[PDB]
Amino acid sequence: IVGGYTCGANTVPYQVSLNSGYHFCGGSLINSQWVVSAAHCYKSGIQVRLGEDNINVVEGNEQFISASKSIVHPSYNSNTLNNDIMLIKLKSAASLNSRVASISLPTSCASAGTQCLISGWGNTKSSGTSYPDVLKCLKAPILSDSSCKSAYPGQITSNMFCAGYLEGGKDSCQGDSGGPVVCSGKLQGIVSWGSGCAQKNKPGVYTKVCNYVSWIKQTIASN
Ligand SMILES: N=C(N)NCCCNC(=O)[C@@H]1CCCCN1C(=O)[C@@H](CC1CCCCC1)NCC(=O)O
Ligand SMILES: [Ca+2]
């Protein structure tokens, strides 16, 4: 997260860290047994880490659970990142508590202008590399689809939306992938892609979760 702020230990209890010997992507707990992340974060051998703040220090509120199965969206296109969403099931249910909680799915999509909270352990430098060990947060509004499509001509589909600032300075970045974009208490987005980080006229692009609610519900009930 570039231009963001330290969230504060466990203030975003639904945030998860996907670990394969190291943290490689973020994710969101939707219930005691299921996590939603980005399809491009797909990998074999994933351990889901919950109740995390500093990812390099065992602080006492963590829950480390292995993934039993991963399901990438049937229409995921790795070339364009359209349908960038994947569901991960935990080998055993997590114990929900004040520091480990699930995030609600949207009943409807949000509109441009709505403020959202994006979080992660990704790079904090636009022109450089510096990875924080504690969770970073960023408040940013959903931008109009016209602003989004003007920035990325011919690359934005109906399954995507832009969020951030056209002036640059604040944006998600490498390492934030798969992380949550929560607006009005609902999971509205998943950190997907962008062009660099915090660059003028190059906002972040996110998977539009509201379009996948039915798929999510059907898939988790049958697995
Ligand atoms: N930058 C912002 N605002 N948010 C960070 C999102 C992180 N996602 C990626 O880096 C993804 C991860 C999967 C590989 C690609 N990669 C990118 O962002 C690519 C985007 C392109 C990949 C192929 C489909 C078209 C878009 N580029 C990164 C960059 O431009 O720096
Ligand atoms: Ca820790």
Side-chain angles (χ1 to χ4, degrees):
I1 299 283
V2 185
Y5 61 90
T6 303
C7 307
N10 310 295
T11 48
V12 189
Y14 51 83
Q15 173 82 236
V16 321
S17 170
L18 299 188
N19 187 288
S20 54
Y22 48 87
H23 159 91
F24 66 95
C25 273
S28 302
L29 193 66
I30 60 173
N31 64 230
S32 52
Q33 310 179 234
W34 290 92
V35 167
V36 182
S37 184
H40 77 251
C41 287
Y42 167 71
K43 175 175 302 188
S44 202
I46 297 174
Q47 180 185 245
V48 182
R49 298 189 159 208
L50 312 165
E52 283 278 21
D53 186 35
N54 182 316
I55 53 173
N56 272 326
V57 179
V58 173
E59 309 186 278
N61 298 297
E62 306 94 332
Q63 282 180 59
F64 298 168
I65 306 170
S66 292
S68 52
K69 67 188 309 177
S70 296
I71 307 166
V72 176
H73 195 271
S75 312
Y76 172 61
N77 185 315
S78 63
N79 287 139
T80 62
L81 262 46
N82 190 208
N83 301 125
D84 193 12
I85 184 175
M86 156 183 76
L87 290 166
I88 303 168
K89 191 183 180 174
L90 304 176
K91 275 197 182 180
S92 60
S95 294
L96 298 176
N97 50 246
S98 40
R99 306 177 193 81
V100 178
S102 56
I103 189 62
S104 311
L105 297 184
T107 44
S108 47
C109 304
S111 59
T114 303
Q115 286 284 138
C116 309
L117 175 68
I118 308 176
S119 51
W121 291 274
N123 185 15
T124 57
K125 300 291 192 178
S126 55
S127 307
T129 304
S130 186
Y131 282 77
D133 289 330
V134 293
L135 192 65
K136 294 293 179 174
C137 280
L138 172 65
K139 293 188 183 70
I142 299 180
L143 305 174
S144 62
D145 284 326
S146 51
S147 295
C148 194
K149 291 169 181 173
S150 293
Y152 305 106
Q155 300 182 93
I156 302 300
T157 66
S158 49
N159 295 312
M160 299 171 199
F161 72 88
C162 287
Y165 303 90
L166 299 186
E167 58 260 49
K170 296 177 187 169
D171 189 13
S172 49
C173 200
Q174 279 64 255
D176 291 322
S177 284
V181 176
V182 175
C183 331
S184 305
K186 305 293 181 176
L187 183 68
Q188 293 287 183
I190 297 167
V191 180
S192 189
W193 60 279
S195 184
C197 307
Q199 301 300 300
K200 184 192 176 184
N201 295 303
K202 292 295 178 173
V205 183
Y206 305 86
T207 308
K208 199 173 179 181
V209 180
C210 61
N211 292 356
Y212 305 88
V213 182
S214 303
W215 169 72
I216 291 176
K217 298 197 157 185
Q218 290 183 86
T219 307
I220 69 170
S222 311
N223 287 272

